[PDB]
Design a protein around this motif. Sequence first.
Motif, PDB file in Angstrom:
ATOM      1  N   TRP A 114       0.843  -1.203   0.000  1.00 31.66           N
ATOM      2  CA  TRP A 114       0.000   0.000   0.000  1.00 31.66           C
ATOM      3  C   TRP A 114       0.858   1.225   0.000  1.00 31.66           C
ATOM      4  O   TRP A 114       2.000   1.198   0.460  1.00 31.66           O
ATOM      5  CB  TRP A 114      -0.962   0.050   1.219  1.00 31.66           C
ATOM      6  CG  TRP A 114      -1.882  -1.065   1.362  1.00 31.66           C
ATOM      7  CD1 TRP A 114      -1.625  -2.266   1.948  1.00 31.66           C
ATOM      8  CD2 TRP A 114      -3.206  -1.159   0.810  1.00 31.66           C
ATOM      9  NE1 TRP A 114      -2.697  -3.064   1.841  1.00 31.66           N
ATOM     10  CE2 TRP A 114      -3.683  -2.433   1.128  1.00 31.66           C
ATOM     11  CE3 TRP A 114      -4.035  -0.292   0.097  1.00 31.66           C
ATOM     12  CZ2 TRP A 114      -4.977  -2.865   0.778  1.00 31.66           C
ATOM     13  CZ3 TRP A 114      -5.277  -0.697  -0.236  1.00 31.66           C
ATOM     14  CH2 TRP A 114      -5.754  -1.981   0.101  1.00 31.66           C
ATOM     15  N   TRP A 115       0.284   2.333  -0.490  1.00 30.17           N
ATOM     16  CA  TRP A 115       0.861   3.649  -0.375  1.00 30.17           C
ATOM     17  C   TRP A 115      -0.220   4.686  -0.216  1.00 30.17           C
ATOM     18  O   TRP A 115      -1.393   4.451  -0.459  1.00 30.17           O
ATOM     19  CB  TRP A 115       1.778   3.964  -1.558  1.00 30.17           C
ATOM     20  CG  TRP A 115       1.155   4.039  -2.916  1.00 30.17           C
ATOM     21  CD1 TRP A 115       0.810   2.971  -3.702  1.00 30.17           C
ATOM     22  CD2 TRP A 115       0.848   5.201  -3.642  1.00 30.17           C
ATOM     23  NE1 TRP A 115       0.233   3.417  -4.877  1.00 30.17           N
ATOM     24  CE2 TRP A 115       0.283   4.786  -4.884  1.00 30.17           C
ATOM     25  CE3 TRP A 115       0.938   6.565  -3.354  1.00 30.17           C
ATOM     26  CZ2 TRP A 115      -0.155   5.693  -5.837  1.00 30.17           C
ATOM     27  CZ3 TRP A 115       0.497   7.448  -4.328  1.00 30.17           C
ATOM     28  CH2 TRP A 115      -0.039   6.999  -5.543  1.00 30.17           C
ATOM     29  N   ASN A 116       0.218   5.885   0.142  1.00 25.97           N
ATOM     30  CA  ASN A 116      -0.714   7.012   0.216  1.00 25.97           C
ATOM     31  C   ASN A 116       0.089   8.309   0.196  1.00 25.97           C
ATOM     32  O   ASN A 116       1.296   8.349   0.498  1.00 25.97           O
ATOM     33  CB  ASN A 116      -1.554   6.947   1.533  1.00 25.97           C
ATOM     34  CG  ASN A 116      -2.914   7.609   1.451  1.00 25.97           C
ATOM     35  OD1 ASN A 116      -3.190   8.398   0.512  1.00 25.97           O
ATOM     36  ND2 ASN A 116      -3.818   7.236   2.407  1.00 25.97           N
ATOM     37  N   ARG A 118      -0.858  12.496   1.206  1.00 23.29           N
ATOM     38  CA  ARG A 118      -1.836  13.440   1.724  1.00 23.29           C
ATOM     39  C   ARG A 118      -1.126  14.698   2.216  1.00 23.29           C
ATOM     40  O   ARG A 118       0.021  14.622   2.574  1.00 23.29           O
ATOM     41  CB  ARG A 118      -2.686  12.855   2.853  1.00 23.29           C
ATOM     42  CG  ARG A 118      -3.509  11.636   2.505  1.00 23.29           C
ATOM     43  CD  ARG A 118      -4.875  11.957   1.901  1.00 23.29           C
ATOM     44  NE  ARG A 118      -4.858  12.186   0.491  1.00 23.29           N
ATOM     45  CZ  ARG A 118      -5.648  13.035  -0.203  1.00 23.29           C
ATOM     46  NH1 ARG A 118      -6.592  13.812   0.360  1.00 23.29           N
ATOM     47  NH2 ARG A 118      -5.478  13.105  -1.541  1.00 23.29           N
ATOM     48  N   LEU A 134      -3.001   7.205   7.581  1.00 21.37           N
ATOM     49  CA  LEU A 134      -2.772   7.018   6.129  1.00 21.37           C
ATOM     50  C   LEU A 134      -3.047   5.586   5.746  1.00 21.37           C
ATOM     51  O   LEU A 134      -3.438   5.356   4.570  1.00 21.37           O
ATOM     52  CB  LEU A 134      -1.377   7.452   5.724  1.00 21.37           C
ATOM     53  CG  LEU A 134      -1.091   8.912   5.916  1.00 21.37           C
ATOM     54  CD1 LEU A 134       0.371   9.181   5.720  1.00 21.37           C
ATOM     55  CD2 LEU A 134      -1.965   9.727   4.950  1.00 21.37           C
ATOM     56  N   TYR A 135      -2.806   4.625   6.651  1.00 22.60           N
ATOM     57  CA  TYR A 135      -2.916   3.163   6.344  1.00 22.60           C
ATOM     58  C   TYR A 135      -4.324   2.667   6.525  1.00 22.60           C
ATOM     59  O   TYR A 135      -4.821   1.883   5.673  1.00 22.60           O
ATOM     60  CB  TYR A 135      -1.971   2.381   7.244  1.00 22.60           C
ATOM     61  CG  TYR A 135      -1.872   0.927   6.860  1.00 22.60           C
ATOM     62  CD1 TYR A 135      -0.977   0.523   5.910  1.00 22.60           C
ATOM     63  CD2 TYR A 135      -2.688  -0.041   7.456  1.00 22.60           C
ATOM     64  CE1 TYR A 135      -0.890  -0.805   5.499  1.00 22.60           C
ATOM     65  CE2 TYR A 135      -2.550  -1.388   7.073  1.00 22.60           C
ATOM     66  CZ  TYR A 135      -1.673  -1.761   6.089  1.00 22.60           C
ATOM     67  OH  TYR A 135      -1.592  -3.132   5.711  1.00 22.60           O
ATOM     68  N   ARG A 138      -7.485   6.874   5.605  1.00 23.61           N
ATOM     69  CA  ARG A 138      -7.421   7.911   4.532  1.00 23.61           C
ATOM     70  C   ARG A 138      -7.238   7.317   3.120  1.00 23.61           C
ATOM     71  O   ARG A 138      -6.622   7.921   2.259  1.00 23.61           O
ATOM     72  CB  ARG A 138      -6.338   8.916   4.851  1.00 23.61           C
ATOM     73  CG  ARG A 138      -6.641   9.775   6.092  1.00 23.61           C
ATOM     74  CD  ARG A 138      -5.835  11.071   6.179  1.00 23.61           C
ATOM     75  NE  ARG A 138      -6.079  11.777   7.442  1.00 23.61           N
ATOM     76  CZ  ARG A 138      -5.698  13.029   7.712  1.00 23.61           C
ATOM     77  NH1 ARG A 138      -5.132  13.802   6.778  1.00 23.61           N
ATOM     78  NH2 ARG A 138      -6.011  13.556   8.917  1.00 23.61           N
ATOM     79  N   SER A 139      -7.791   6.121   2.966  1.00 21.53           N
ATOM     80  CA  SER A 139      -8.018   5.462   1.654  1.00 21.53           C
ATOM     81  C   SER A 139      -6.700   5.312   0.843  1.00 21.53           C
ATOM     82  O   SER A 139      -6.545   5.890  -0.237  1.00 21.53           O
ATOM     83  CB  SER A 139      -9.065   6.231   0.912  1.00 21.53           C
ATOM     84  OG  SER A 139     -10.321   5.990   1.573  1.00 21.53           O
ATOM     85  N   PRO A 140      -5.730   4.559   1.412  1.00 19.87           N
ATOM     86  CA  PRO A 140      -4.513   4.295   0.675  1.00 19.87           C
ATOM     87  C   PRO A 140      -4.781   3.531  -0.653  1.00 19.87           C
ATOM     88  O   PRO A 140      -5.836   2.876  -0.822  1.00 19.87           O
ATOM     89  CB  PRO A 140      -3.711   3.446   1.606  1.00 19.87           C
ATOM     90  CG  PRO A 140      -4.713   2.712   2.410  1.00 19.87           C
ATOM     91  CD  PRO A 140      -5.862   3.673   2.575  1.00 19.87           C
ATOM     92  N   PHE A 141      -3.844   3.737  -1.570  1.00 19.31           N
ATOM     93  CA  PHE A 141      -3.780   2.980  -2.796  1.00 19.31           C
ATOM     94  C   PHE A 141      -3.037   1.661  -2.664  1.00 19.31           C
ATOM     95  O   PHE A 141      -2.023   1.505  -1.983  1.00 19.31           O
ATOM     96  CB  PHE A 141      -3.091   3.815  -3.872  1.00 19.31           C
ATOM     97  CG  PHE A 141      -3.762   5.140  -4.151  1.00 19.31           C
ATOM     98  CD1 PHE A 141      -5.043   5.172  -4.610  1.00 19.31           C
ATOM     99  CD2 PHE A 141      -3.046   6.296  -4.017  1.00 19.31           C
ATOM    100  CE1 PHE A 141      -5.651   6.383  -4.901  1.00 19.31           C
ATOM    101  CE2 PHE A 141      -3.669   7.526  -4.271  1.00 19.31           C
ATOM    102  CZ  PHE A 141      -4.929   7.544  -4.707  1.00 19.31           C
ATOM    103  N   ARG A 150      -5.012  11.432  -7.336  1.00 20.52           N
ATOM    104  CA  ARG A 150      -6.050  12.067  -6.542  1.00 20.52           C
ATOM    105  C   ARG A 150      -5.670  13.532  -6.262  1.00 20.52           C
ATOM    106  O   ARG A 150      -4.483  13.856  -6.089  1.00 20.52           O
ATOM    107  CB  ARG A 150      -6.068  11.338  -5.194  1.00 20.52           C
ATOM    108  CG  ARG A 150      -7.299  11.593  -4.353  1.00 20.52           C
ATOM    109  CD  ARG A 150      -7.653  10.368  -3.504  1.00 20.52           C
ATOM    110  NE  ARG A 150      -6.620  10.037  -2.563  1.00 20.52           N
ATOM    111  CZ  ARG A 150      -6.502   8.887  -1.887  1.00 20.52           C
ATOM    112  NH1 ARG A 150      -7.370   7.849  -2.069  1.00 20.52           N
ATOM    113  NH2 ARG A 150      -5.473   8.767  -1.059  1.00 20.52           N
TER     114      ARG A 150
END
Length: 177
Positions: A114-116, A118, A134-135, A138-141, A150
Amino acid sequence: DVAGAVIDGAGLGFDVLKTVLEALGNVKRKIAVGIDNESGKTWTAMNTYFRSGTSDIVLPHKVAHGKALLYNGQKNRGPVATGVVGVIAYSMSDGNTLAVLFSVPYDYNWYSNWWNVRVYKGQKRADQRMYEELYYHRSPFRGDNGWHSRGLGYGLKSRGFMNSSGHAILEIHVTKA
Ligand SMILES: CCCCCC(=O)OC[C@H](COP(=O)(O)OCC[N+](C)(C)C)OC(=O)CCCCC
Ligand SMILES: CCCCCC(=O)OC[C@H](COP(=O)(O)OCC[N+](C)(C)C)OC(=O)CCCCC
Ligand SMILES: CCCCCC(=O)OC[C@H](COP(=O)(O)OCC[N+](C)(C)C)OC(=O)CCCCC
Ligand SMILES: CCCCCC(=O)OC[C@H](COP(=O)(O)OCC[N+](C)(C)C)OC(=O)CCCCC
Ligand SMILES: CCCCCC(=O)OC[C@H](COP(=O)(O)OCC[N+](C)(C)C)OC(=O)CCCCC
Ligand SMILES: C[N+](C)(C)CCOP(=O)(O)O
Ligand SMILES: C[N+](C)(C)CCOP(=O)(O)O
């Protein structure tokens, strides 16, 4: 083109990150991170919070508009079955914080990459709570070998790519919305 340096932003691509990844050593879990700053703002490194793993690289301290930073991380160098999981925080010159999550787990039977990315209001060092935000919240990719984009608010947007394996690349571009 080494971890800890900045390069011209338009030069960031998978081959640079492959180079960084290979230079680190053949360890079981590791990540090469490049972030292209096309935000119109100057970025100053704060810290990396590691939930799992470590790095011997100093975050590139100053990242001008038009530059990309190169960074890496790896699992704990001992025998522990843990991965490389953390948050990078940069202070941006108009007063806010760019946060980047990466997660490269040890065991892909229970977890995935996963990543994010913000922006946080004000100046906010990376820490466990930021990592949990973030994990989990806040809707990680997914590190799904695909691109995701985004809006960040604050007049900024992000586009990035993370692969799926334990030898991870993470390429992020931050641009003006
Ligand atoms: C908080 C210290 C106690 C040990 C728990 C820990 O740090 O996580 C260790 C391990 C390592 O996680 P890691 O691969 O480094 O990172 C992926 C998991 N996240 C992203 C949640 C941390 O994940 C686990 O909880 C193993 C239990 C398996 C239950 C199915
Ligand atoms: C809060 C701990 C239990 C549930 C957490 C969770 O979301 O499990 C993720 C699981 C999938 O976790 P994943 O890393 O995709 O796969 C774990 C690896 N497997 C599937 C082999 C068990 O659910 C899904 O298929 C969609 C969730 C994605 C956004 C919330
Ligand atoms: C609809 C835009 C959401 C993202 C852009 C933005 O305005 O971010 C401002 C702030 C940047 O985050 P932060 O500085 O942590 O401020 C929100 C948290 N509070 C209200 C506790 C300060 O996030 C929010 O207030 C809402 C998104 C957070 C909920 C997941
Ligand atoms: C029967 C206990 C099962 C524990 C769940 C697990 O496998 O790990 C999830 C959590 C994932 O770590 P993290 O992502 O850092 O989230 C920690 C705080 N929470 C869970 C509230 C977000 O790691 C823990 O802190 C549980 C450790 C119990 C070890 C006996
Ligand atoms: C039976 C379905 C719920 C448990 C399996 C699953 O959904 O994969 C969940 C998780 C993968 O969870 P996580 O990385 O927290 O979720 C991925 C989605 N995000 C990144 C948004 C949180 O791994 C575990 O800790 C299993 C512990 C078993 C306790 C029953
Ligand atoms: C926490 N530590 C980095 C000092 C030791 C190893 O921890 P972990 O990698 O088992 O979470
Ligand atoms: C599954 N989980 C319990 C590790 C995540 C939920 O925790 P929290 O962030 O809501 O406290």
